[PDB]
């Protein structure tokens, strides 16, 4: 079933997200990614419409996969006796933000803005079909080189939006919300707004702002680049320390900082090309 329809290349990465290879598919030559979950690893479960019993991970993913390529797409999928496997698209060239970060140091503002810009609207995506990444940081974006297009990937640690509150996280910490740290309760949307400020100051810095629980509570951002006020202004406020004081993504999106930003082609030919 697996076996004719892909060919299997090398391992592109492995860790709490499982274990993914570079592929081909068979019939049409096209580029994809191929992961793979064991069941043990699996805390997490979910039920299709179907009712068939399935890793939340493809739950959120297929209730996320449309038009919109913000949102790093499932094409198929399998059970095996212990292990889930997903077939992803896969852009070629591609880098990870990490990488991309590490690779160029601190990003000038323009392209950070474009960058920042495309997570909001697909993390805006996923919330408008019900869906909570609850892992959003520099790992889990891509880059399509090309285009100049960004990708959400590893919905793993993700969840069923809800307005109620949330008490359990298996997330990143360092991009975790103060009220995270001290009361182990969130809300989606503002742990969601207060992981972008992280990833916001990473983007611009180099580096994530915060390392030890003590930094994040205090909640006191040092700039370690040259950084423009309004930036530093939308990052301040992402950061909040009270959930009802950060932004909306509409506030975000209407901030200052973020006006007159590039279309994906014209970030690609002027800072990727
Ligand atoms: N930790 C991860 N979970 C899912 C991952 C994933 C999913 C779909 C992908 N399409 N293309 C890639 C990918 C990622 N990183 C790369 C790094 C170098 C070269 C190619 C790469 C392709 C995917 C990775 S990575």
């Given at each position: 079933?697996?076996?004719?329809?892909?060919?299997?290349?090398?391992?592109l990465?492995?860790?709490?997200?499982?274990?993914?290879?570079?592929?081909?598919?068979?019939?049409?030559?096209?580029?994809?990614?191929?992961?793979?979950?064991?069941?043990?690893?699996?805390?997490?479960?979910?039920?299709?419409?179907?009712?068939?019993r399935?890793?939340?991970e493809?739950?959120?993913?297929?209730?996320?996969?449309?038009?919109?390529?913000?949102?790093?797409?499932?094409?198929?999928?399998?059970?095996?006796?212990?292990?889930?496997?997903?077939?992803?698209?896969?852009?070629?060239?591609?880098?990870?933000?990490?990488?991309?970060?590490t690779?160029?140091?601190?990003?000038?503002?323009?392209?950070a803005?474009?960058?920042?810009?495309?997570?909001?609207?697909?993390?805006?995506?996923?919330?408008?079909?019900?869906?909570?990444?609850?892992?959003?940081?520099?790992?889990?974006?891509?880059?399509?080189?090309?285009?100049?297009?960004?990708?959400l990937?590893?919905?793993?640690?993700?969840?069923?939006?809800?307005?109620?509150?949330?008490?359990?996280?298996?997330?990143?910490?360092?991009?975790?919300?103060?009220?995270?740290?001290?009361?182990?309760?969130?809300?989606?949307?503002?742990?969601?707004?207060?992981?972008?400020?992280?990833?916001?100051?990473?983007?611009?810095?180099?580096?994530?702002?915060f390392?030890?629980?003590?930094?994040?509570?205090?909640?006191?951002?040092?700039?370690?680049?040259?950084?423009?006020?309004?930036?530093?202004?939308?990052?301040?406020?992402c950061?909040?320390l009270?959930?009802?004081?950060?932004?909306?993504?509409?506030?975000?999106?209407?901030?200052?900082?973020?006006?007159?930003?590039?279309?994906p082609?014209?970030?690609?030919?002027?800072?990727?090309?």
């Amino acid at each position: 079933p697996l076996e004719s329809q892909y060919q299997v290349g090398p391992l592109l990465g492995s860790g709490g997200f499982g274990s993914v290879y570079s592929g081909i598919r068979v019939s049409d030559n096209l580029p994809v990614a191929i992961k793979h979950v064991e069941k043990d690893r699996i805390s997490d479960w979910g039920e299709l419409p179907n009712g068939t019993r399935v890793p939340m991970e493809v739950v959120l993913l297929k209730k996320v996969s449309s038009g919109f390529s913000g949102v790093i797409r499932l094409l198929d999928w399998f059970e095996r006796p212990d292990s889930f496997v997903l077939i992803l698209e896969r852009p070629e060239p591609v880098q990870d933000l990490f990488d991309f970060i590490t690779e160029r140091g601190a990003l000038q503002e323009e392209l950070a803005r474009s960058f920042f810009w495309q997570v909001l609207e697909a993390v805006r995506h996923c919330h408008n079909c019900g869906v909570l990444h609850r892992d959003i940081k520099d790992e889990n974006i891509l880059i399509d080189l090309n285009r100049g297009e960004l990708k959400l990937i590893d919905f793993g640690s993700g969840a069923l939006l809800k307005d109620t509150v949330y008490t359990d996280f298996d997330g990143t910490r360092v991009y975790s919300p103060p009220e995270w740290i001290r009361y182990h309760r969130y809300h989606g949307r503002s742990a969601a707004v207060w992981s972008l400020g992280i990833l916001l100051y990473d983007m611009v810095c180099g580096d994530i702002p915060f390392e030890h629980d003590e930094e994040i509570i205090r909640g006191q951002v040092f700039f370690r680049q040259r950084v423009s006020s309004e930036c530093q202004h939308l990052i301040r406020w992402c950061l909040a320390l009270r959930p009802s004081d950060r932004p909306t993504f509409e506030e975000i999106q209407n901030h200052p900082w973020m006006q007159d930003v590039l279309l994906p082609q014209e970030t690609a030919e002027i800072h990727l090309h």
